Ligand binder design. Structure first.
Ligand code: A1IIV
Ligand code: A1IIV
Ligand code: A1IIV
Ligand code: A1IIV
Ligand code: A1IIV
Ligand code: NAG
Ligand code: NAG
Ligand code: NAG
Ligand code: NAG
Ligand code: NAG
Ligand code: NAG
Ligand code: NAG
Ligand code: NAG
Ligand code: NAG
Ligand code: OCT
Ligand code: OCT
Ligand code: OCT
Ligand code: OCT
Ligand code: OCT
Ligand code: OCT
Ligand code: OCT
Ligand code: OCT
Ligand code: OCT
Ligand code: OCT
Ligand code: OCT
Ligand code: OCT
Ligand code: OCT
Ligand code: OCT
Ligand code: OCT
Ligand code: OCT
Ligand code: OCT
Ligand code: OCT
Ligand code: OCT
Ligand code: OCT
Ligand code: HEX
Ligand code: HEX
Ligand code: HEX
Ligand code: HEX
Ligand code: HEX
Ligand code: HEX
Ligand code: HEX
Ligand code: HEX
Ligand code: HEX
Ligand code: HEX
Ligand code: CL
Lengths: 322, 322, 322, 322, 322
């Protein structure tokens, strides 16, 4: 009866795992998941599978035999969807040796949930993992381990992504507990991710800075030229508002506060204050004309104060986000 | 014949349910649904499943036995789509004890319809539920209950969402009736949802307020400077219209009136009225010049009246939506 | 042989239908279809299904028996896609009575084609239907009818949609003909749909109207102030063009002429004419100065003529679309 | 052995086809394909299927018999995806007559590749086709033809599309050759498509034309009014650029040159030239003032030359695209 | 036992491949993959499949026989998803000759990963490939080759794409190694891709260039006209910012630096510098008036220097990207 595991009732059966990674097919920021294609290999010794031959060499069967014999039942923990490839036929392999050591191999694609924090965007780093576990059998019945330690993971040379950079592949293990079912062995495949920083500096942190620098030109124009100093500021407000909407249309769409939002909103406040400045100046000059019937003090102070505050802002901001 | 339930013809069979929640995979606002992955467990006593062993301990089978024996038929009420995971094999478990107490377990993902009201957006709170029912059998044949009361629900520590905050998981039960079929027992899994308010305050309720404040600067400029007071107002109208279209491009897309729409439209009316104000002033000054051949009264009254009305608006608005 | 219908060769077998509607899952305007989840019930009398019991009460089987016995073959006319739910097992029920009266029940989701006319958008009303027919058997072999007349349809209390309002559920029947196959009986489920009008009035018919009102302010400014009357009109053109593009980005995307398009284009023409007006005025004043070396007549006539024409436009427009 | 065709080894078996079209479900411009739902019927005479009855009338089986007997193997040439409907059961019909004439019928949806040329957009016309072929058997084994000539195609009265107009359904046949396999018979279903022209005239060819007409107003304003003639032109440039981006956001997205692109770019050049015109005029007047210390000739020539060139452009353009 | 290959234990079985390409269904730039539909053919000699007939001619079976006999197990290396077509029945063919030479044929669609570099966009060229391999058997058991060399690939005459141009189809072979499994034979189908350059020149490299040319007009306007030279520059900044956001909304969405980005950002810097220029000029004139109580030198130098620098930029840029 190939429904009972090898060594039933006695000690747990040692099953060993080997993995090779093919590709990383996609990543979704809004749904917080990633998709991967890999090869998965198993090993064990079963005597009901022995045969009399002198060759001392393995012999090959396929998926049809897999539905007759007994086989492990690993599954992917914290997955959203997976499948096994089937063209032009099932991507399954089964090799059987004279002494009874089986090898069993699959090709699969998995989508796995990854929790991500965007508060430092775009200067963040994300960490993700793939988890492997047996579904039905506890650690007293089935024992699970990496076949050759840290060397039981292999990775493909052309694995790439359009939005990210990948580094630091390694394996770990950990024991897990379910309250209604027991203690299970679990294996992990970990890696790290990062973005192209110097592109975001030019896409977002550059136009805003130029706009704030453009609002300071007003302090050097003659206060007598009202039809020239009034339209300049409000057009500058318009430009900055347009920019803040273009950046939002090109970003992934997240609804809590991010690093880049802070910088843009502060630049906006600097440009709004410049408009209030000249309104004060105009009003004071006008009441002086009325009272009686050279650069203004507020102009020659603004020319110093505004840039220095912006410089202080930048120092603190980049001390916090580094 | 494992087509007749245990206890056929006599009294109803008691079946008990246990649940553990894995993840919340996605939420759709336009279609009004959510997607969830969970583990589902059942329990009962059947004597046709007894076997002679002294061990007083459970013994394990899998999905192939499930197609031979009799098994409950629960289903998900008010679901749009669901499925059972099958890699690397069916995520199914079956454990059978010497006295005949069966345990049966599945891994599944469900999308369930949730009715939502957006009239208070973005200050709303949404309530959603998952419902479990037997398809074929009434309460006189099958009896359904939570195995250990309020403690029959377990939830994962890293359950998270990018747009929402989750709280208040608990269980309830209720009897249900179909007119052509009878009375059935139903179980419920309830929870609550909310948004990040202080992000929306800065994304939407901040730029508009600054714009209305910018339209008030006009009352302090000299009425003699026509080429300076005329372009200011119409450029301010342009800026506010641009803003009202950016917010609409970044929101989920709903076609009845929402809280945030009201605030934006009222700000728009304030800016339109400021333009009509100076047109009155200009016309009156001009006819005075013609008649005959200092700040105007309407200017020095507007400087008080406009801000006070806006303050009254804000008081009432936040008294209504709190 | 359960491949021959009950009453083969003699008279047609009467089969009766009962329906209960669960939810309306989605609607697509571009592809012209809707998606629905319902319960579907059948009834008939078959003697090969009789059994000797005294109970005078029905007894329950499930989907496995359905593959052995004979069963109707209804299908959904003018559907694009459908399916039967299968978690945690097939959503199928079969109840069999001592005298041989079978009851058979399914849970299904269907997407059905609905032809829609958008010429009156957004003041339109759409009518849609679900059609049920037997695939293989003509009216001389199988007879199909509603079990209890108008009362054979039941509907759920919380059926809702985010963009529409639903009303007027009722049933009808009609005989249908295929040229290569014969006459068949058909059943229908009809209902009506409508939009939230007073939201569209504020989203689209309000900003344009304010813009046209803003273009009339120019007639009251002094014709001597050229740098003040020239930029006003062209900025107003810019604002109206921006608005006409935002509305188009927020609508469903249809490529023939709709009611709302007409109103927007007419407003655009009014604003373009205002610019041509002042160009005439300026030119005439200038040639007068040249000839020789008070309000202009065209100004004081425009102040009356423009609003009156707009009022005439609105009267006719709302007499046509009501 | 129902694996050998009727008439094996001798002459080819005549199989006849009949078709009725239900709906046209969708069209994709970017991927260049369309999706269709239809009924497909076959006919032939097989003697291994004869039975002794006097009725001289056909008798009905279904899909389960289809898996036992022999049946044709038609397939859809140049399809991307297809399927057969299966709710509430397989949409399959089989009718068998006393003399052995079989009728066999299916309901299916197909997506078929259609090659399209967009160079004349939006004044184009597209032609598409559906192709039917036998997969395994050459013209010496299986003979394929339309059952009743041009009358073997039927079409539904409410077939409609939201973006197109459909006309000219007819059938054709053609012999085809594969180099590694042989000569096969092929059947075709052809039709024609077109757009709503007079909507595109108003959506795209109208605003641009008004803008070019607005740039000509500048020639009639007094050259002495620099602060009035300078902002007019550059604001007009801004408006035209905005328009050219809105049209691009509402079109299907194709990356070679189209008819409508040409018209928009030429209008853009006309508006840019108007700005250069006044710059010349201003410079010449200024140097005249300097030299010494009425309408300008370039103004009164532009008033004639610009409109006449635009009229010439329109004549040629509509002579080419008609 | 048709589970052992022909020639088991002795020498490897020679299997030969032939391919014909139907269509190229789609391409995704963000996910870096392409989708293809093709016919795939195999050949070999097996004696357990011989039959006694004099005809010296092949005889036809179908997919049902394929599940009984032994058959190769090729698969698609570096694929994301594939499938075999099944309407109206499995697209499978099997022809068997008196001497035992089998022919076996399939119709399939595959999506295959293609690594792409966008740094030269839009002047890039991409190279892609399709790879074929045996899953279970090494080169000592199964030998794989192209049936007729370079002539074993055929391609369809109407293969086309909406965004690209296709050229250079040819075949290659290469031996491959897996560390846990052995050496395998691999076949390749290669081709080349390119874009429509002269469309992108007009869509992107034309408006920016005109804008930079428009910013140079300012050097020829009289420095005394402040209300005419100040609004011109800031409106030009606004126009250029708008343009840079429209291009980004119409491109595929990639997050590292591309060729076209560089050109746009440099144009932006030229327009910002023009505004700073007149601010210097105005300030110097004003202090001169104050000191004392003709074209400026910076104006007549700018008129030469700005265009020459832009010309130098273009020379270098097109020397680098050619
Ligand atoms: Cl971010 C934005 C506008 N939005 C664009 N899309 C959605 N909201 C905004 C927020 C704060 C401030 Cl200070 C200025 C601006 Cl313009
Ligand atoms: Cl909300 C909008 C424009 N739209 C943008 N997308 C769709 N409509 C609008 C509505 C009312 C008022 Cl008072 C002002 C404006 Cl700008
Ligand atoms: Cl509706 C549009 C521009 N488009 C925006 N998206 C696509 N086209 C338009 C059409 C006619 C008139 Cl009179 C004015 C305008 Cl602005
Ligand atoms: Cl069509 C476009 C801008 N784009 C908008 N989306 C993508 N590019 C443009 C092209 C040529 C000319 Cl002469 C003027 C303009 Cl504004
Ligand atoms: Cl490209 C962009 C704005 N963005 C539009 N969408 C996203 N960012 C920008 C970047 C650099 C410079 Cl110098 C100018 C501009 Cl306007
Ligand atoms: C491939 C391999 O490891 N083969 C071994 C061989 O080395 C050893 O001599 C034999 C025992 O006789 O068992 C087998
Ligand atoms: C992170 C990781 O892969 N670590 C382990 C390392 O810590 C251990 O010391 C070594 C030998 O056991 O193998 C490896
Ligand atoms: C909301 C909820 O979970 N409630 C019940 C509570 O009301 C009840 O009193 C208690 C003991 O029965 O168990 C829990
Ligand atoms: C549930 C029901 O309708 N049962 C009927 C019963 O009323 C009737 O007396 C009997 C004939 O003896 O047939 C059965
Ligand atoms: C629309 C509809 O449901 N109509 C019918 C009604 O016309 C008929 O008179 C009545 C009794 O037959 O039942 C109901
Ligand atoms: C429906 C039909 O065409 N039936 C024919 C009948 O007309 C003819 O008389 C008979 C030969 O006896 O064959 C059968
Ligand atoms: C286009 C088309 O359907 N054509 C044929 C027509 O050419 C032919 O002359 C006629 C009779 O054979 O039948 C039809
Ligand atoms: C189609 C074909 O190649 N047929 C060959 C024939 O040429 C040859 O004469 C024969 C041997 O007798 O084998 C077979
Ligand atoms: C690229 C390619 O297809 N190349 C080969 C060519 O190099 C070789 O010389 C020839 C004969 O072997 O066949 C072909
Ligand atoms: C979490 C602090 C946000 C501060 C935003 C300030 C915007 C001017
Ligand atoms: C709105 C501007 C008011 C300026 C007042 C300045 C008083 C010192
Ligand atoms: C932000 C500028 C403040 C200038 C204050 C000047 C007081 C004399
Ligand atoms: C939540 C961190 C806010 C940091 C603000 C920094 C302002 C310079
Ligand atoms: C339901 C009341 C809506 C009021 C909208 C007012 C817009 C100015
Ligand atoms: C359009 C402005 C008219 C202003 C008239 C004011 C009469 C008191
Ligand atoms: C909204 C301002 C009204 C001002 C009225 C002044 C009447 C003298
Ligand atoms: C439907 C509620 C409208 C509330 C309007 C509040 C205006 C201050
Ligand atoms: C079908 C009549 C359309 C009229 C459009 C008029 C646009 C100014
Ligand atoms: C382009 C404006 C011309 C105005 C001419 C008016 C002649 C009565
Ligand atoms: C649309 C306004 C026309 C004004 C005509 C005035 C003729 C004296
Ligand atoms: C096709 C109907 C056009 C109606 C135009 C109404 C103009 C007032
Ligand atoms: C194929 C000719 C294109 C011409 C484009 C001209 C744009 C000004
Ligand atoms: C940039 C404008 C220069 C105009 C020069 C005109 C010489 C006839
Ligand atoms: C495009 C207008 C050209 C005008 C030339 C005038 C030469 C005196
Ligand atoms: C490729 C056709 C170009 C036609 C240009 C027509 C310009 C009037
Ligand atoms: C990799 C060099 C980028 C240079 C960008 C310059 C933008 C002004
Ligand atoms: C912000 C403009 C300052 C110009 C100073 C020029 C000194 C030579
Ligand atoms: C970019 C223009 C520089 C002009 C310098 C002029 C120095 C006299
Ligand atoms: C990474 C290549 C940068 C090339 C810059 C060229 C500037 C002319
Ligand atoms: C905004 C500056 C105000 C200065 C008041 C003296
Ligand atoms: C004259 C003060 C200049 C300040 C520059 C930061
Ligand atoms: C808009 C203010 C009008 C005042 C009339 C006296
Ligand atoms: C002079 C009146 C000022 C009012 C500020 C709200
Ligand atoms: C646009 C008005 C023109 C009037 C001609 C007398
Ligand atoms: C003086 C005429 C006013 C007209 C208002 C509609
Ligand atoms: C742009 C017109 C220039 C005329 C030179 C005489
Ligand atoms: C005075 C010339 C007018 C030309 C109109 C096309
Ligand atoms: C921007 C030009 C400055 C020149 C200083 C002499
Ligand atoms: C007078 C100098 C002109 C320079 C044109 C590039
Ligand atoms: Cl001025």
């Amino acid at each position: 009866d190939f429904s009972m595991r090898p060594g039933f009732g006695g000690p747990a059966i040692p099953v060993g795992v080997d993995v090779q990674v093919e590709s990383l097919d996609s990543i979704s920021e809004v749904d917080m998941d990633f998709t991967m294609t890999l090869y998965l290999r198993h090993y064990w010794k079963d005597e009901r599978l022995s045969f009399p031959s002198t060759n001392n060499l393995s012999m090959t069967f396929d998926g049809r035999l897999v539905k007759k014999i007994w086989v492990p039942d690993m599954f992917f923990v914290h997955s959203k969807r997976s499948f096994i490839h089937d063209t032009t036929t099932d991507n399954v392999m089964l090799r059987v040796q004279p002494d009874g050591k089986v090898l069993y191999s699959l090709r699969v694609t998995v989508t796995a949930m990854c929790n991500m924090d965007f508060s430092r965007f775009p200067l963040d780093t994300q960490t993700c993992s793939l988890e492997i576990e047996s579904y039905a059998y506890t650690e007293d019945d089935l024992m699970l381990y990496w076949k050759k330690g840290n060397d039981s993971l292999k990775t493909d040379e052309r694995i790439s992504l359009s939005q990210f950079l990948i580094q630091e592949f390694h394996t770990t293990t950990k024991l897990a507990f379910y309250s209604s079912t027991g203690w299970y062995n679990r294996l992990y495949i970990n890696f790290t991710l990062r973005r192209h920083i110097f592109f975001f500096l030019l896409q977002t942190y550059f136009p805003a800075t130029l706009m704030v620098m453009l609002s300071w030109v007003s302090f050097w124009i003659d206060r007598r030229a009202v039809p020239a100093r009034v339209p300049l500021g409000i057009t500058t407000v318009l430009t900055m508002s347009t920019i803040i909407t273009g950046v939002n249309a090109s970003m992934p769409r997240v609804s809590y506060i991010k690093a880049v939002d802070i910088y843009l909103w502060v630049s906006f406040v600097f440009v709004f204050l410049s408009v209030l400045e000249y309104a004060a100046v105009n009003y004071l000059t006008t009441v002086q004309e009325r009272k009686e019937q050279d650069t203004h003090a507020i102009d020659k102070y603004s020319r110093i104060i505004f840039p220095a505050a912006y410089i202080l802002f930048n120092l603190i901001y980049w001390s916090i986000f580094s």
